[PDB]
Design an enzyme around this catalytic site. Structure first.
Site, short mmCIF file in Angstrom:
data_model
loop_
_atom_site.label_atom_id
_atom_site.label_comp_id
_atom_site.label_asym_id
_atom_site.label_seq_id
_atom_site.Cartn_x
_atom_site.Cartn_y
_atom_site.Cartn_z
N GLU A 193 -43.34 -8.84 -45.95
CA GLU A 193 -44.11 -7.68 -46.32
C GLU A 193 -43.33 -6.75 -47.26
O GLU A 193 -43.86 -6.31 -48.29
CB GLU A 193 -44.59 -6.94 -45.07
CG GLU A 193 -45.63 -7.76 -44.36
CD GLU A 193 -45.66 -7.55 -42.87
OE1 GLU A 193 -44.93 -6.69 -42.37
OE2 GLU A 193 -46.44 -8.25 -42.17
N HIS B 145 -38.84 -4.35 -39.25
CA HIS B 145 -38.38 -5.21 -38.16
C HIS B 145 -38.21 -6.60 -38.67
O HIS B 145 -38.95 -7.04 -39.53
CB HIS B 145 -39.35 -5.18 -36.97
CG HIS B 145 -40.74 -5.67 -37.31
ND1 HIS B 145 -41.74 -4.83 -37.74
CD2 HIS B 145 -41.28 -6.95 -37.31
CE1 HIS B 145 -42.85 -5.54 -37.98
NE2 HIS B 145 -42.57 -6.84 -37.72
N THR B 146 -37.21 -7.30 -38.13
CA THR B 146 -36.97 -8.71 -38.45
C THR B 146 -36.43 -9.37 -37.18
O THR B 146 -36.46 -8.74 -36.12
CB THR B 146 -36.06 -8.86 -39.71
OG1 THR B 146 -36.05 -10.23 -40.14
CG2 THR B 146 -34.60 -8.38 -39.47
N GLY C 56 -45.09 -8.23 -32.80
CA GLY C 56 -45.04 -7.24 -33.86
C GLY C 56 -45.77 -5.97 -33.49
O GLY C 56 -45.24 -4.89 -33.65
N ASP C 57 -46.99 -6.11 -32.98
CA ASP C 57 -47.83 -4.97 -32.61
C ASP C 57 -47.12 -4.05 -31.62
O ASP C 57 -47.22 -2.81 -31.69
CB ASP C 57 -49.16 -5.46 -31.99
CG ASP C 57 -49.99 -6.28 -32.96
OD1 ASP C 57 -49.85 -6.06 -34.20
OD2 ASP C 57 -50.79 -7.14 -32.51
N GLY D 12 -56.48 -8.99 -31.85
CA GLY D 12 -56.41 -8.02 -32.95
C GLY D 12 -55.29 -6.99 -32.76
O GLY D 12 -54.87 -6.71 -31.62
N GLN D 13 -54.84 -6.40 -33.87
CA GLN D 13 -53.72 -5.46 -33.83
C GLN D 13 -54.02 -4.16 -33.07
O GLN D 13 -53.26 -3.77 -32.17
CB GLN D 13 -53.26 -5.20 -35.25
CG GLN D 13 -52.94 -6.48 -36.00
CD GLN D 13 -52.72 -6.24 -37.47
OE1 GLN D 13 -53.62 -6.49 -38.29
NE2 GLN D 13 -51.55 -5.73 -37.82
N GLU E 271 -52.12 -18.25 -39.92
CA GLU E 271 -53.47 -17.92 -39.52
C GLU E 271 -54.47 -18.24 -40.62
O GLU E 271 -54.40 -17.70 -41.72
CB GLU E 271 -53.55 -16.46 -39.12
CG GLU E 271 -54.97 -15.98 -39.00
CD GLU E 271 -55.07 -14.57 -38.47
OE1 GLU E 271 -54.02 -13.93 -38.20
OE2 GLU E 271 -56.22 -14.11 -38.33
N1 LIG Z 1 -38.60 -14.50 -28.92
C1 LIG Z 1 -38.61 -13.22 -29.36
N2 LIG Z 1 -38.01 -12.23 -28.65
C2 LIG Z 1 -38.01 -10.95 -29.04
N3 LIG Z 1 -38.58 -10.55 -30.18
C3 LIG Z 1 -39.21 -11.42 -30.99
C4 LIG Z 1 -39.28 -12.84 -30.61
N4 LIG Z 1 -39.97 -13.47 -31.58
C5 LIG Z 1 -40.34 -12.54 -32.51
N5 LIG Z 1 -39.88 -11.32 -32.15
C6 LIG Z 1 -40.06 -10.06 -32.91
O1 LIG Z 1 -41.44 -9.97 -33.29
C7 LIG Z 1 -41.52 -9.81 -34.70
C8 LIG Z 1 -42.73 -10.52 -35.22
O2 LIG Z 1 -43.28 -9.59 -36.13
P1 LIG Z 1 -44.21 -10.05 -37.35
O3 LIG Z 1 -43.54 -11.32 -37.85
O4 LIG Z 1 -44.10 -8.90 -38.33
O5 LIG Z 1 -45.58 -10.19 -36.68
C9 LIG Z 1 -40.23 -10.35 -35.28
O6 LIG Z 1 -39.92 -9.68 -36.51
C10 LIG Z 1 -39.21 -10.09 -34.19
O7 LIG Z 1 -38.56 -8.82 -34.40
O1 LIG Z 2 -51.03 -9.39 -33.63
C1 LIG Z 2 -51.75 -10.52 -33.21
C2 LIG Z 2 -53.12 -10.45 -33.85
O2 LIG Z 2 -52.91 -10.61 -35.25
C3 LIG Z 2 -54.02 -10.93 -36.10
O3 LIG Z 2 -54.97 -9.87 -36.22
C4 LIG Z 2 -54.73 -12.18 -35.55
O4 LIG Z 2 -55.85 -12.50 -36.35
C5 LIG Z 2 -55.17 -11.92 -34.11
O5 LIG Z 2 -55.66 -13.07 -33.52
C6 LIG Z 2 -54.03 -11.53 -33.23
O6 LIG Z 2 -54.73 -11.10 -32.10
#
Ligand SMILES: Nc1ncnc2c1ncn2[C@@H]1O[C@H](COP(=O)(O)O)[C@@H](O)[C@H]1O
Ligand SMILES: OC[C@H]1O[C@H](O)[C@H](O)[C@@H](O)[C@@H]1O
EC number: 2.7.1.-
Length: 466
Positions: free
Chosen positions: A307, A351-352, A449-450, A119-120, A95
């Protein structure tokens, strides 16, 4: 004896139970505060043909140079397209902020396929209020018609001053003539190919054209009436602070915002509101450090590998940081414990890809079931792109549980006790572990993630209410 196929069956069973537990517990949650980042997400599903033409028009040379010399922010069309191709090559969530006016015009012309809440806090709001029906109060820095209407129907509210009285109204009833905060989201699937670059994993590039969330501008109501807002909720989830820089060309500093955030935490704490911090990657070292020092004032924190590792790095644990970044689960566990030692925080949700962990000072299966609920919500969001009915989450039950994480748990049993499946006792902490549900061909990647953090946090709370 408990074999792999038996283990697969056992998780199916615990997944089913957890979903039911969460469903029955969610209606107990009496309000969630969500802040500070809400915007508009403009989603384009990339097209090989279209992308190539665009690179070609602007100059393929320059664009390919930019893939190797990535800027920090977008200032030209080349840097935009370079950022997108780079994101494809590295199969990476990225981003970049869009400073250039001419590029913002280019972004809007190039357009989008779908418009979603962004946004989150925004995404979390739609989910918590719209899907889960938990009364929700959300910070919305700018609320024009196009912003407001992306909110689904349900108990979603924004605070507004009418006299000395603070009112809670639906966003569509607080429309103002304010700015559209557009984040341009470029989704690509596994194997997407442009020129000779192919995507290893599915991801998105976000061209951030949003000047308000960039500095964490807060509405009057949140500055002057945070207390009255607080009396309305039991939970709070705070995100969006990762954007903050130490210094700005206008002489302002990150301190202006964090002093304000800290007041909020003090108020939240006075009312015993339980709070979760999304600790998104914070590029600025000084700010990251300031955020860590705030952590004791939160109940809970959510984080991923980079993180967690970035946090280990600033408290001076680089050996551990590198190992966390290498994905070593037992290193992740040590990092969570170090973090908890450092801060005294009640809860850490990690989470991963393929599994979640939650370390907590308190105990109970609710921690695990909430991880399981969130895992399903994440999977459902990946399948459908956007969620609308809680029953759609039931659909995620048929996505296979990640087999590698199931096997990985054998390693956890050998090292730690394990008093129940996915549940570990330590002397004054509990560790919950869950193999997740990875969707092979996701509709979209934004907001997963959210969905994970907010789902575990709120359903856990609901399930724990005696
Ligand atoms: N295709 C998918 N199916 C299910 N969970 C996913 C997938 N891609 C990403 N995720 C989850 O979403 C998270 C993304 O979180 P972040 O990278 O912290 O925004 C990853 O850590 C996974 O646990
Ligand atoms: O979690 C997804 C969100 O993450 C960040 O805030 C991005 O800037 C936003 O576009 C997106 O809506």
């Amino acid at each position: 004896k408990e074999s792999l196929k038996d283990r697969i069956r056992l998780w199916k069973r615990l997944y089913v139970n957890a979903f039911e537990n969460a469903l029955n517990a969610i209606p107990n949650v009496k309000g969630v505060l969500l802040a500070y980042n809400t915007n508009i997400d403009a989603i384009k599903y990339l097209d090989k043909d279209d992308l190539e033409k665009r690179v070609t028009e602007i100059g393929k040379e320059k664009v390919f140079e930019i893939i190797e010399n990535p800027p920090e922010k977008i200032s030209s069309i080349e840097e935009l397209l370079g950022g997108i191709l780079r994101s494809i090559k590295l199969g990476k969530a990225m981003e970049w902020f869009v400073e250039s006016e001419e590029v913002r015009r280019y972004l809007r012309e190039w357009g989008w396929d779908e418009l979603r809440i962004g946004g989150q806090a925004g995404i979390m709001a739609n989910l918590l209020g719209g899907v889960y029906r938990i009364p929700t109060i959300v910070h919305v820095p700018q609320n024009p018609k196009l912003q407001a209407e992306l909110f689904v129907d349900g108990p979603i509210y924004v605070p507004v001053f009418e006299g000395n009285k603070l009112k809670l109204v639906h966003p569509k009833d607080a429309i103002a003539e304010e700015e559209e905060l557009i984040h341009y989201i470029y989704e690509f699937p596994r194997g997407f190919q442009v020129f000779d670059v192919q995507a290893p994993r599915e991801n998105r590039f976000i061209a951030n054209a949003d000047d308000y969330n960039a500095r964490v501008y807060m509405r009057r109501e949140f500055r002057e009436g945070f207390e009255e807002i607080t009396r309305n909720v039991e939970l709070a989830i705070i995100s969006g602070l990762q954007v903050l820089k130490e210094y700005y060309p206008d002489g302002t500093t990150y301190r202006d915002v964090l002093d304000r955030v800290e007041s909020h935490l003090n108020i939240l704490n006075r009312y015993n509101v339980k709070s979760h911090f999304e600790f998104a990657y914070t590029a600025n070292r000084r700010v990251r450090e300031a955020l860590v020092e705030l952590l004791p004032k939160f109940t809970s924190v959510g984080l991923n590998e980079v993180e967690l590792a970035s946090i280990m790095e600033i408290i001076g644990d680089e050996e551990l940081a590198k190992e966390v970044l290498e994905g070593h689960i037992f290193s992740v566990i040590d990092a969570m414990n170090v973090l908890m030692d450092e801060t005294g925080i009640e809860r850490i949700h990690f989470h991963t890809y393929g599994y979640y962990l939650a370390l907590t000072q308190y105990r109970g299966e609710e921690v695990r079931d909430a991880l399981l609920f969130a895992s399903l919500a994440a999977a459902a969001k990946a399948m459908k792109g956007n969620l609308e009915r809680i029953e759609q989450i039931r659909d995620a039950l048929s996505v296979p549980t990640n087999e590698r994480a199931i096997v990985l748990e054998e390693e956890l049993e050998k090292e730690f006790t394990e008093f129940e499946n996915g549940l570990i006792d330590m002397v004054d902490r509990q560790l919950a572990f869950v193999p997740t549900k990875i969707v092979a061909s996701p509709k979209s990647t934004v907001g997963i993630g959210d969905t994970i953090s907010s789902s575990a946090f709120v359903s856990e709370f609901g399930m724990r209410k005696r």
